[PDB]
């Protein structure tokens, strides 16, 4: 029967919202209206048709990683007989922008394309707020009093409005860019400050050392001692390390307190430890939290807790009971394929009739860093915690080609975290290059419960990175009742 104008009002058209959207209207024929601020990328908005990851978030940013990488790659053929003058040579940031520019757009166009040409979706450019459980308003603007555009009439509520970035609130806070703004600079930084200590922080320092000009420098200033809170330990001191060795300053217990405007248009920046830098731009990558604020969720009843995440079950349904929301607005894991998972998890429960939750343990990520890290599962700190006995295996190598190409700082480590009674693997740590693409196979036999023997009976591949998982048989040391010993019991 027809009881409403929609089945479904899905508000944020990001990587959650379109895969429940799309999966909704065309494998249930369910009448999906997809809420969204702007169809193409750009500032102020940023964000727009496809959110974060394809606007602002990893398309854009691997493009960027990937264009920096050539200043290592064109160094390092010189080893192999490659001669050019590369005396002053410094990347064209213009034509980078340009290109990437060109690939988001031509994504949001074929996002248009979905729209336009599939039966029952529709796409509604503007601000969506609760009224009610069954109403979301669609305004001109953030702002509550902005006119009213749509009043869209549902059955289900689906929010997908994702996070946006945390601001360091001191004076001179406002001279400070974000990912966003960093996305659209009209020229590359020569002297640039990367705050932070996050996957942000680290994968923009690499791309603006891999495009600063000639005489340019990155500094990366973290306010705790060790950047990558949640990463293995020893994968964290190996990639300060080898940032360092391509040129980034990393900085640690360093926090700013002021900035001010230079004559220039520069950036004075104060410090803690009392010292005063300038920098061309200063970039904040300290936190990305719900965005919940706009949404008028009180009104509607909704519960909202931590840094205004929206609370969910096991199957992402809120306090009332024909509302839901799914990805970063919900906190929990802040992935682009999670999101998704949480998405096509809702349609299957819902719409469906087939009850599905999105397992949010043994989820592979990457840092797309130079070199760049791919892990899977627990660190050996909460193993020695939540486990009676672990086994710590370990491997650092370097490729026979960074003997020629000069690059011997290029580490590649392998860190095992096991189980010692059964030998089941609980966490696989990697540094260096293809880390990202090896890590996706290694999340598929940990969701199988993989053991180490099942790693090491594997035969290897010659020659890679890779066939160093499948040649460690001896712990390098272990935890038994949550503290390290030499050897065991
Ligand atoms: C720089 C950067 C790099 C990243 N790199 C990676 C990576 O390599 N791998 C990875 O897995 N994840 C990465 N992420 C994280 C990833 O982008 C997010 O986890 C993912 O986009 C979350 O999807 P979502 O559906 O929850 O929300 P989003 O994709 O953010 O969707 C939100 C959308 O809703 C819109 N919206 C917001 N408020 C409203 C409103 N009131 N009304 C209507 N529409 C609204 C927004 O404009 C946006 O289009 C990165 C993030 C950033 C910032
Ligand atoms: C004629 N028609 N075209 N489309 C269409 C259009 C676009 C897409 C997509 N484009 C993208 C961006 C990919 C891209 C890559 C390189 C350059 C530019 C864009 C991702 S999904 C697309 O993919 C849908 C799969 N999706 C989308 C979101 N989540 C999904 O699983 C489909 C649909 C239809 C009718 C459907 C049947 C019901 N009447």
């Known amino acids: 029967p027809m009881s409403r104008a929609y089945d479904l009002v899905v508000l944020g058209a990001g990587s959650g919202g379109l895969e429940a959207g799309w999966n909704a209207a065309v494998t249930h024929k369910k009448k999906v209206a997809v809420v969204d601020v702007q169809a193409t990328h750009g500032p102020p908005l940023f964000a727009a048709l496809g959110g974060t990851c394809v606007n602002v978030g990893c398309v854009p940013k691997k493009l960027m990683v990937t264009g920096a990488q050539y200043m290592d790659l064109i160094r390092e053929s010189g080893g192999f007989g490659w001669e050019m003058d590369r005396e002053s040579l410094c990347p064209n940031w213009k034509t980078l922008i340009a290109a990437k520019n060109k690939v988001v757009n031509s994504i949001n166009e074929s996002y248009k394309s979905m729209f336009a040409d599939t039966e029952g979706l529709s796409f509604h450019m503007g601000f969506g707020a609760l009224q009610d459980a069954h109403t979301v308003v669609v305004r001109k603007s953030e ?62 320092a690499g791309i603006f050392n891999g495009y600063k000009p000639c005489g340019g420098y990155v500094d990366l200033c973290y306010r705790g001692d060790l950047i990558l809170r949640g990463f293995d330990t020893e994968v964290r001191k190996s990639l300060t390390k080898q940032l360092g060795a391509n040129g980034i300053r990393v900085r640690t217990n360093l926090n700013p307190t002021k900035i001010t405007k230079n004559e220039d248009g520069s950036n004075h920046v104060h410090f803690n430890d009392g010292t005063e830098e300038d920098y061309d731009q200063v970039m904040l990558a300290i936190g990305r939290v719900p965005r919940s604020q706009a949404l008028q969720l009180d009104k509607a009843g909704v519960r909202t807790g931590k840094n205004g995440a929206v609370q969910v079950d096991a199957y992402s349904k809120t306090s009332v009971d024909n509302i839901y929301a799914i990805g970063d607005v919900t906190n929990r894991v802040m992935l682009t394929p999670v999101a998704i998972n949480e998405g096509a998890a809702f349609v299957e429960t819902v719409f469906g009739g087939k009850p599905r939750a999105t397992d949010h343990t043994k989820v592979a990520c990457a840092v797309f860093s130079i070199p760049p890290i791919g892990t899977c599962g627990m660190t050996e700190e909460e193993a020695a915690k939540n486990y009676e006995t672990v086994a710590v295996y370990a491997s650092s190598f370097t490729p026979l080609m960074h003997n020629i190409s000069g690059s011997k700082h290029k580490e590649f480590m392998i860190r095992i975290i096991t189980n010692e009674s059964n030998g089941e693997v609980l966490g696989v740590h990697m540094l260096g290059d293809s880390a990202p693409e090896i890590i996706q196979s290694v999340g598929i036999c940990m969701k199988m419960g993989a053991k180490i023997s099942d790693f090491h009976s594997t035969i290897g591949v010659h020659p890679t990175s890779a066939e160093e998982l499948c040649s460690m048989r001896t712990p390098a040391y272990f935890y038994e009742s949550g503290k390290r010993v030499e050897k065991l019991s």
């Open 143 to 204: 702002d509550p009093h902005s006119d009213v555009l749509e009043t869209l009439d549902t059955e289900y509520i689906l929010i997908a409005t994702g996070s946006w970035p945390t601001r360091l609130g001191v004076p001179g806070d406002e001279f400070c860019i974000t990912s966003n703004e960093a996305f659209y600079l009209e020229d590359a930084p020569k002297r640039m400050l990367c705050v932070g200590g996050g996957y942000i922080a680290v994968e923009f």
